[PDB]
Design an enzyme around this catalytic site. Sequence first.
Site, PDB file in Angstrom:
ATOM      1  N   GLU A  84      -2.657  -5.025  13.333  1.00 47.61           N
ATOM      2  CA  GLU A  84      -1.560  -5.910  14.084  1.00 47.61           C
ATOM      3  C   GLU A  84      -2.304  -6.691  15.150  1.00 47.61           C
ATOM      4  O   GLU A  84      -1.797  -7.974  15.295  1.00 47.61           O
ATOM      5  CB  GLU A  84      -0.251  -5.132  14.157  1.00 47.61           C
ATOM      6  CG  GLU A  84       0.533  -5.900  15.034  1.00 47.61           C
ATOM      7  CD  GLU A  84       1.758  -4.987  15.136  1.00 47.61           C
ATOM      8  OE1 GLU A  84       2.622  -4.744  14.064  1.00 47.61           O
ATOM      9  OE2 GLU A  84       2.138  -4.413  16.192  1.00 47.61           O
ATOM     10  N   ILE A 103       0.145   5.224   0.148  1.00 46.33           N
ATOM     11  CA  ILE A 103      -1.115   6.160   0.192  1.00 46.33           C
ATOM     12  C   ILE A 103      -0.571   7.615   0.443  1.00 46.33           C
ATOM     13  O   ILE A 103       0.365   7.458   1.457  1.00 46.33           O
ATOM     14  CB  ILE A 103      -2.057   5.687   1.334  1.00 46.33           C
ATOM     15  CG1 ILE A 103      -2.697   4.131   1.294  1.00 46.33           C
ATOM     16  CG2 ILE A 103      -3.313   6.534   1.688  1.00 46.33           C
ATOM     17  CD1 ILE A 103      -3.205   3.955   0.031  1.00 46.33           C
ATOM     18  N   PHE A 115       0.821  -1.292  -0.055  1.00 44.09           N
ATOM     19  CA  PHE A 115       0.205   0.058   0.011  1.00 44.09           C
ATOM     20  C   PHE A 115       0.929   1.419  -0.113  1.00 44.09           C
ATOM     21  O   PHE A 115       1.710   1.378   0.737  1.00 44.09           O
ATOM     22  CB  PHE A 115      -1.061   0.018   1.322  1.00 44.09           C
ATOM     23  CG  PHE A 115      -2.050  -1.000   1.149  1.00 44.09           C
ATOM     24  CD1 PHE A 115      -1.783  -2.395   1.105  1.00 44.09           C
ATOM     25  CD2 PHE A 115      -3.263  -0.634   0.880  1.00 44.09           C
ATOM     26  CE1 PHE A 115      -2.692  -3.325   1.030  1.00 44.09           C
ATOM     27  CE2 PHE A 115      -4.278  -1.662   0.355  1.00 44.09           C
ATOM     28  CZ  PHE A 115      -3.912  -3.038   0.731  1.00 44.09           C
ATOM     29  N   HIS A 156       8.247  -9.243  15.614  1.00 42.11           N
ATOM     30  CA  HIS A 156       8.547  -7.772  15.660  1.00 42.11           C
ATOM     31  C   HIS A 156       9.963  -7.648  16.105  1.00 42.11           C
ATOM     32  O   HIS A 156      10.305  -8.347  17.208  1.00 42.11           O
ATOM     33  CB  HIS A 156       7.313  -7.447  16.475  1.00 42.11           C
ATOM     34  CG  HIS A 156       7.265  -5.999  16.664  1.00 42.11           C
ATOM     35  ND1 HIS A 156       8.250  -4.978  16.983  1.00 42.11           N
ATOM     36  CD2 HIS A 156       6.035  -5.197  16.329  1.00 42.11           C
ATOM     37  CE1 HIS A 156       7.643  -3.640  16.895  1.00 42.11           C
ATOM     38  NE2 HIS A 156       6.468  -3.477  16.403  1.00 42.11           N
TER      39      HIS A 156
HETATM   40  C1  LIG Z   1      10.338   5.848  18.755  1.00 41.73           C
HETATM   41  C2  LIG Z   1       9.468   4.721  18.277  1.00 41.73           C
HETATM   42  C3  LIG Z   1       9.748   3.372  18.715  1.00 41.73           C
HETATM   43  C4  LIG Z   1       8.576   2.379  18.818  1.00 41.73           C
HETATM   44  C5  LIG Z   1       9.230   0.874  18.834  1.00 41.73           C
HETATM   45  C6  LIG Z   1       7.904  -0.072  19.007  1.00 41.73           C
HETATM   46  O1  LIG Z   1       7.672  -0.160  17.728  1.00 41.73           O
HETATM   47  C7  LIG Z   1       6.074  -0.224  17.259  1.00 41.73           C
HETATM   48  O2  LIG Z   1       5.422  -1.362  18.010  1.00 41.73           O
HETATM   49  C8  LIG Z   1       3.995  -1.207  18.039  1.00 41.73           C
HETATM   50  C9  LIG Z   1       3.480  -2.338  18.708  1.00 41.73           C
HETATM   51  O3  LIG Z   1       3.984  -2.081  20.205  1.00 41.73           O
HETATM   52  C10 LIG Z   1       3.777  -1.314  16.646  1.00 41.73           C
HETATM   53  O4  LIG Z   1       4.026  -2.453  15.855  1.00 41.73           O
HETATM   54  C11 LIG Z   1       4.279   0.026  15.834  1.00 41.73           C
HETATM   55  O5  LIG Z   1       3.985   0.017  14.404  1.00 41.73           O
HETATM   56  C12 LIG Z   1       5.846  -0.092  15.980  1.00 41.73           C
HETATM   57  O6  LIG Z   1       6.555   0.919  15.544  1.00 41.73           O
HETATM   58  C13 LIG Z   1       6.792   0.929  14.040  1.00 41.73           C
HETATM   59  O7  LIG Z   1       8.134  -0.049  14.028  1.00 41.73           O
HETATM   60  C14 LIG Z   1       9.288   0.396  14.870  1.00 41.73           C
HETATM   61  C15 LIG Z   1      10.217  -0.910  14.938  1.00 41.73           C
HETATM   62  C16 LIG Z   1       9.944   1.577  14.455  1.00 41.73           C
HETATM   63  O8  LIG Z   1      10.415   1.304  12.912  1.00 41.73           O
HETATM   64  C17 LIG Z   1       8.653   2.840  14.472  1.00 41.73           C
HETATM   65  O9  LIG Z   1       9.353   4.131  14.149  1.00 41.73           O
HETATM   66  C18 LIG Z   1       7.393   2.352  13.419  1.00 41.73           C
HETATM   67  O10 LIG Z   1       6.479   3.318  13.998  1.00 41.73           O
END
Ligand SMILES: CCCCCCO[C@@H]1O[C@H](CO)[C@H](O)[C@H](O)[C@H]1O[C@@H]1O[C@@H](C)[C@@H](O)[C@@H](O)[C@@H]1O
Lengths: 270, 270
Positions: free
Chosen positions: B228, B52, B50, B158
Amino acid sequence: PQPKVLTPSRKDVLVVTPWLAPIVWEGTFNIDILNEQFRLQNTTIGLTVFAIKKYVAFLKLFLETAEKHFMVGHRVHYYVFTDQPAAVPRVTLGTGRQLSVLEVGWQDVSMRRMEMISDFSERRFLSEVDYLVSVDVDMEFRDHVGVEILTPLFGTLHPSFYGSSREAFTYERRPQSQAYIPKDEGDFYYMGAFFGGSVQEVQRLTRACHQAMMVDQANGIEAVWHDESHLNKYLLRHKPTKVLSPEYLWDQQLLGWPAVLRKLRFTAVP
Amino acid sequence: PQPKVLTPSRKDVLVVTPWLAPIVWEGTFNIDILNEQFRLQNTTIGLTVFAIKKYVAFLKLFLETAEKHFMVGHRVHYYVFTDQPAAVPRVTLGTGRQLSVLEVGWQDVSMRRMEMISDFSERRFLSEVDYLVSVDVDMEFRDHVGVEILTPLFGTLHPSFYGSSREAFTYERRPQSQAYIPKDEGDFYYMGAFFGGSVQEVQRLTRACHQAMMVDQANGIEAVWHDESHLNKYLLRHKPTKVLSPEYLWDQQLLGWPAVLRKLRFTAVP
Ligand SMILES: CCCCCCO[C@@H]1O[C@H](CO)[C@H](O)[C@H](O)[C@H]1O[C@@H]1O[C@@H](C)[C@@H](O)[C@@H](O)[C@@H]1O
Ligand SMILES: CCCCCCO[C@@H]1O[C@H](CO)[C@H](O)[C@H](O)[C@H]1O[C@@H]1O[C@@H](C)[C@@H](O)[C@@H](O)[C@@H]1O
């Protein structure tokens, strides 16, 4: 229990082949998860065993111990192939488990197991079961043998060869045989005494091995280890989706109880 | 090379789940064996992405790098879902690779990926491909991503959670949501940014997640991490047949290059 990504399930043995098939050892599976998955499909397992001439004496302990350890809680159908149908012992079975006796009527003897499993796998079996497993009768179950083994196609590492280099494997080496495997080829040496899979994959493996052995018979050749040599050529070209460790096929009098075997599940009778 | 039974493929990580699904890390597969197996079936892989609003800017590097690293030598069909079909860059593709542009027309936005992959997986896809893979666009391939991933159903660990206990996982915890997972349940935390499987299994996962999200919308609830959270509930009940390690979904600016990652294959763009 939560699986822990940063802890190997085993530190001492290979638990996945290079084509991503699991190698089944104790410590690699949670039987409660697997039991649930297979019970949700009402899985039925056919067990084939040949008991010919004096080998009918082994059936009593084989069946008694299969009732204690083989696929307990799942549907099981035993198919006993024998020249002495009236000599099959009357062993009491748990619920959901049944036994059928199939009467059997030197190179023809050598081809018998693959020929007969092939004919049978296209008939009865094909309606009656989800998976077929072929084992030898001169054996006993001593520990759990369950749905962790089930998969479209599996072979079992031979207990004499699991630590050997491929040149030492006793494959058929004469190019004149359909079982021929070159000196630089081969993943493992699988034993003829324990193989199986889905009914379709067992149809395919037994037809291929029977047809290969007939071509060799026409050409005046018998492979060095008979249908085991054909099993190994087949599994080289059609890679199994699980491989059983030698927990599943062991000879304790010959080989003792090495550190790498946490369980001796199915063993030779001495 | 001969696999060696008495040498672990990895000493530092889990390479098979407790339900006997491979966890795919470098060192666990021989790509030449896998490439052969999949080429013998003339395997075709559909890649959905995607792009967008301002995210269309990421497509150029995403496609250029997919051409260097994704399924090279196999049949690939890219399906780009976008609100700006005329803004898709004209990237030159290798032989056997094609790209289709599918135009897309706040909770509806949240349901969009599962709803649209579900509708599409029952149409085009279903004729056109063997496996479907869903990834995000704000990423680049830096190393091989190939047929080692393919299987009936896979999820990807993840990169923030692979070393965490399950209580720390950010599952949906309100019993009122279809995505609910109790505090004592859960195998892994999978990321929404990389999942896939056979076309049938992707049809099933996307229908289930879309229908679950619609029930939540009716009830006035949005799961904590949107599709997710539904992906993780689905993969808890329907266990994946392979799990990809975080080699396949990494953020190097955030998380560096730990010792356990031998390759960084598909990474966030900083
Ligand atoms: C400063 C941001 C750090 C966030 C780490 C955790 O990642 C996030 O996890 C949530 C679930 O708890 C979601 O999966 C979310 O999409 C994740 O954030 C994304 O992936 C991480 C690895 C990083 O690349 C972030 O910049 C993204 O927004
Ligand atoms: C004294 C006998 C020791 C033989 C060890 C090798 O086992 C045999 O291996 C060949 C292939 O090289 C065949 O697989 C053969 O059936 C094997 O013998 C049988 O299995 C071994 C483990 C042992 O139980 C023997 O008594 C069997 O005859």
